[PDB]
Amino acid sequence: LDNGLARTPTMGWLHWERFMCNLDCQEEPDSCISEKLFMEMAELMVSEGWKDAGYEYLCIDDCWMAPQRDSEGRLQADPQRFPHGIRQLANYVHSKGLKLGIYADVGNKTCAGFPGSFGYYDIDAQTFADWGVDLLKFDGCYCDSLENLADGYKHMSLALNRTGRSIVYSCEWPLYMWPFQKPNYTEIRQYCNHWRNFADIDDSWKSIKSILDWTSFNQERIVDVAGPGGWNDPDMLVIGNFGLSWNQQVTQMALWAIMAAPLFMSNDLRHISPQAKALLQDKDVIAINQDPLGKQGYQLRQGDNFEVWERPLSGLAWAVAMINRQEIGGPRSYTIAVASLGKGVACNPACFITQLLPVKRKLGFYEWTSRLRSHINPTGTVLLQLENTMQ
Amino acid sequence: LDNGLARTPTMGWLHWERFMCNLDCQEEPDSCISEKLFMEMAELMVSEGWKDAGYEYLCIDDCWMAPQRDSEGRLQADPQRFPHGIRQLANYVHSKGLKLGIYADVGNKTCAGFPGSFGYYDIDAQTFADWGVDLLKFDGCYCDSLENLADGYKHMSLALNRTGRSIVYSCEWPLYMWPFQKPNYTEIRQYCNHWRNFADIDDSWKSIKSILDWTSFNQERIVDVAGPGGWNDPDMLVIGNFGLSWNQQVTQMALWAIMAAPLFMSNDLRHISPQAKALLQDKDVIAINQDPLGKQGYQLRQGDNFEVWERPLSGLAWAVAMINRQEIGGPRSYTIAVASLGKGVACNPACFITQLLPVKRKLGFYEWTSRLRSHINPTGTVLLQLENTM
Ligand SMILES: *[C@@H]1O[C@H](CO)[C@@H](O[C@@H]2O[C@H](CO)[C@@H](O[C@@H]3O[C@H](CO)[C@@H](O)[C@H](O[C@H]4O[C@H](CO)[C@@H](O)[C@H](O)[C@@H]4O)[C@@H]3O)[C@H](O)[C@H]2NC(C)=O)[C@H](O)[C@H]1NC(C)=O
Numbered sequence A: 001l002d003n004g005l006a007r008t009p010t011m012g013w014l015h016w017e018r019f020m021c022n023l024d025c026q027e028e029p030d031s032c033i034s035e036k037l038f039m040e041m042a043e044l045m046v047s048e049g050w051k052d053a054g055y056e057y058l059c060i061d062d063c064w065m066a067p068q069r070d071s072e073g074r075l076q077a078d079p080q081r082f083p084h085g086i087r088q089l090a091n092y093v094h095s096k097g098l099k100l101g102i103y104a105d106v107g108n109k110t111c112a113g114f115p116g117s118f119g120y121y122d123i124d125a126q127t128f129a130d131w132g133v134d135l136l137k138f139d140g141c142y143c144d145s146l147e148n149l150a151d152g153y154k155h156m157s158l159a160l161n162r163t164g165r166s167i168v169y170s171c172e173w174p175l176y177m178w179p180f181q182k183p184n185y186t187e188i189r190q191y192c193n194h195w196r197n198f199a200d201i202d203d204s205w206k207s208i209k210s211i212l213d214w215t216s217f218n219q220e221r222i223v224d225v226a227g228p229g230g231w232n233d234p235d236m237l238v239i240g241n242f243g244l245s246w247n248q249q250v251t252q253m254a255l256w257a258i259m260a261a262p263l264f265m266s267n268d269l270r271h272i273s274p275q276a277k278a279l280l281q282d283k284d285v286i287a288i289n290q291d292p293l294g295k296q297g298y299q300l301r302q303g304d305n306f307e308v309w310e311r312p313l314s315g316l317a318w319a320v321a322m323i324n325r326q327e328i329g330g331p332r333s334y335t336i337a338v339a340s341l342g343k344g345v346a347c348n349p350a351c352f353i354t355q356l357l358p359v360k361r362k363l364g365f366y367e368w369t370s371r372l373r374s375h376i377n378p379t380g381t382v383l384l385q386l387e388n389t390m391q
Numbered sequence B: 001l002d003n004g005l006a007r008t009p010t011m012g013w014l015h016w017e018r019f020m021c022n023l024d025c026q027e028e029p030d031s032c033i034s035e036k037l038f039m040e041m042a043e044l045m046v047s048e049g050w051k052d053a054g055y056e057y058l059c060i061d062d063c064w065m066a067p068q069r070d071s072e073g074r075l076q077a078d079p080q081r082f083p084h085g086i087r088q089l090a091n092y093v094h095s096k097g098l099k100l101g102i103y104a105d106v107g108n109k110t111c112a113g114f115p116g117s118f119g120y121y122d123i124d125a126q127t128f129a130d131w132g133v134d135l136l137k138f139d140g141c142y143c144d145s146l147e148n149l150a151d152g153y154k155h156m157s158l159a160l161n162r163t164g165r166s167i168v169y170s171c172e173w174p175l176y177m178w179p180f181q182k183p184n185y186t187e188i189r190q191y192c193n194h195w196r197n198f199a200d201i202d203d204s205w206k207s208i209k210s211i212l213d214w215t216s217f218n219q220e221r222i223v224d225v226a227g228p229g230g231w232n233d234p235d236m237l238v239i240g241n242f243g244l245s246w247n248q249q250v251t252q253m254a255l256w257a258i259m260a261a262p263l264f265m266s267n268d269l270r271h272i273s274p275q276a277k278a279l280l281q282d283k284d285v286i287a288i289n290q291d292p293l294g295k296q297g298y299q300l301r302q303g304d305n306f307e308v309w310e311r312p313l314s315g316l317a318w319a320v321a322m323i324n325r326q327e328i329g330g331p332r333s334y335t336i337a338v339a340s341l342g343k344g345v346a347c348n349p350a351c352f353i354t355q356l357l358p359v360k361r362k363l364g365f366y367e368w369t370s371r372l373r374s375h376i377n378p379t380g381t382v383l384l385q386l387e388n389t390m
């Protein structure tokens, strides 16, 4: 989308995976979808270094709204759970120097069954701008017409534009299109700042694997359409929760950097390990993801339960990810000629290789004819940065 | 098996899952299957408090053997990887106050393709005893019939007894007959100290789940046969490795205790996190696994992606495990009437409840009328001990 936004992949926090549609503030007050949750999450984003690292957008997902629209036919937030309204939540979020994301649906209802935006595209978009919203995530449920889906996503894109407010437009267009046709990504890129391609992530290694495998299987379709202002969205970062081992967390962080993915954490910033925090806040890994070239990486090799992904960065630098998919035994050795990496351009005539994950370690100078030798933990990833040098 | 052994589930370390069949001592001298690897673990078992916690058997799995038998038709350890031989290794392990486990196969070859014991059961049993072996894991590969399977497991069982040496006998009998015929567990227990029921574990949560699921599905068949001298074996503890989250490691530890399962760690004792070590050495959880009554727990309930398991213990106590199988969202609330626990006796008229996992916490007194409420992490387990008040 040519709105001057998402020149790098969007970074922030989104409630969905960790909090979902918990409406029970009486028995589960700490995990219910409330203004207090977002207020407190915004406080920690500042005080715990998240904003400084680049996580700017505090995002509301589904189940924020009242059962029906008001007397003006406008969306309203739940009166019990958001008694002070979205406008005051946006003011609070902005005062902490952060940006606010909200959620709506192209169809007649949201996925969780609250009021949909079909027939209300122009007022909803204006409503959000009036409330001071900075990002919209726009879902695809309860729209069974291929035409309506496309027209709706297109309509809402222009409906937001016409408010004059800078609002990041997050689309689930391609995901809800697959059931009918192969999505036109040129068309989607024109209207959307980023786009969900694949099934919802959950808190599991199974889910990470299936997202990676779908991406690499479909990479000839989707890699090259990604760029400044339009990104593929492989879904939320789930580091800091319950389902991934440390190595599986390393794999998600490394690969979301390779894929030029929007980085939306879905976790509890009030209850998160120092180890998970350090990984999510890793400035070198975040710098790869946020690389100004804005060129998405890809799978270079697959075989013997190994994967090699790489990503071109600005200034003739490359990020290289090596995954060990064998889920038994111990660390496995992997060797590759550095001439195979970066299309033979990285490391010509030399490169300086620095390991970034699982730990940061300088590996040294590698000549063009040399071999890189590494060891990778089961379900882990080794992430390397290659700096092209004359030395 | 009535040999006076495995009166509680066996506890130890077994190389298979973490170290496998690594024969590459040239490129990987520190992780290949060698005498040295077993010496390193033996030393850490003593020095890192593993032995003090109950882990007594240091066990060699597959891939210890030389490609062929010796001049006298006896099994031999690989000459380059086990230069001093097994008797010498057993000497060393014994001097550390530990016990040595080894591996053989009922068929014509081991699963990795080394010499099988078929046709040599008495020879092999006697050489094992002469070596000072303390435990035998007896696998089921390359056995061409069910009759040969049964006959061989029986034969070796009696052949070990005849040696006069106390040797814990670990059988994979039910696993290899399951695809064809349903096992007779009364028959298996008569001949075996413990028995592998299900597919090899690996370093994954998927694996823990399928083992748990198989066990609860088959529990009517397997629960009651378990007891002192004869245990169900759901395979190795894989805590301390790579594929399990903290909560999934908790689930494995908690449920292997509920299940009165043998506790064979398969990990690297040289590179293990303090967190993993403290869980594996958890005194109170081990004490549940090791409960002298030796009655296997079972799944009490499942629904809304929760499972409840319980186990009767000595002195009218019960262990209770609550698993959250929902792999999305946050810690999730679960409640149960304490009157539904322990067959209605645990908390009549009252019980004191102590949480052991994920952390230790006294929960207080619960009346017959009470409800237990708990938040359980996704893929995690809450493990509690209930003491009847009298
Ligand atoms: C509503 O829709 C319209 C139509 O797309 C949209 O206007 C577009 O905005 C973009 C970005 O604001 C404009 O592109 C600019 O073009 C000039 C001249 O070529 C560039 O100099 C601009 O900046 C570049 O350099 C900067 C670095 O110094 C970067 O910050 C920047 O990313 C660029 O690289 C910029 O590219 C574009 O011209 C218009 N398109 C049209 C047809 O007018 C508008 O922004 C939409 N949104 C809203 C809420 O109004």
Ligand SMILES: *[C@@H]1O[C@H](CO)[C@@H](O[C@@H]2O[C@H](CO)[C@@H](O[C@@H]3O[C@H](CO)[C@@H](O)[C@H](O)[C@@H]3O)[C@H](O)[C@H]2NC(C)=O)[C@H](O)[C@H]1NC(C)=O
Pocket: B002, B003, B004, B160, B161, B162, B163, B164, B165, B166, B167
């Ligand atoms: C070979 O097989 C025989 C027969 O199965 C084994 O004998 C059994 O050994 C156990 C343990 O030594 C005996 O149980 C014990 O009995 C005594 C009192 O009689 C009691 O004080 C102990 O607490 C325990 O219950 C068991 O009676 C005995 N069975 C028979 C029928 O003799 C023998 O141990 C085996 N030998 C080897 C080396 O495995």
Ligand SMILES: *[C@@H]1O[C@H](CO)[C@@H](O)[C@H](O)[C@H]1NC(C)=O
Pocket: A106, A107, A108, A118, A142, A143, A144, A145, A148, A149
């Ligand atoms: C919403 O419902 C109306 C009728 O109430 C119908 O015309 C339309 O097809 C629905 N919209 C979508 C996008 O499914």
Ligand SMILES: *[C@@H]1O[C@H](CO)[C@@H](O)[C@H](O)[C@H]1NC(C)=O
Pocket: B106, B107, B108, B118, B142, B143, B144, B145, B148, B149
């Ligand atoms: C071992 O192989 C021989 C030779 O064919 C065969 O007769 C015997 O049944 C085999 N034993 C087992 C247990 O597979």
Ligand SMILES: *[C@@H]1O[C@H](CO)[C@@H](O)[C@H](O)[C@H]1NC(C)=O
Pocket: B184, B185, B186, B187, B190
């Ligand atoms: C099972 O095996 C035992 C011991 O061999 C025997 O006594 C019993 O009759 C068998 N029962 C069945 C189910 O055939």
Ligand SMILES: OC[C@H]1O[C@@H](O)[C@H](O)[C@@H](O)[C@H]1O
Pocket: A219, A220, A223, A224, A298
């Ligand atoms: O396979 C998909 C990818 O293949 C790479 O070799 C290429 O540089 C990328 O632009 C993309 O096309």
Ligand SMILES: OC[C@H]1O[C@H](O)[C@H](O)[C@@H](O)[C@H]1O
Pocket: A016, A061, A062, A110, A111, A112, A139, A172, A196, A200
């Ligand atoms: O109900 C909300 C839910 O709807 C869809 O399933 C989306 O893919 C999720 O990310 C979430 O927004």
Ligand SMILES: OC[C@H]1O[C@H](O)[C@H](O)[C@@H](O)[C@H]1O
Pocket: B016, B061, B062, B110, B111, B112, B139, B172, B196, B200
């Ligand atoms: O090759 C050794 C291997 O053989 C079988 O698969 C066993 O069930 C495993 O536990 C292991 O002992």
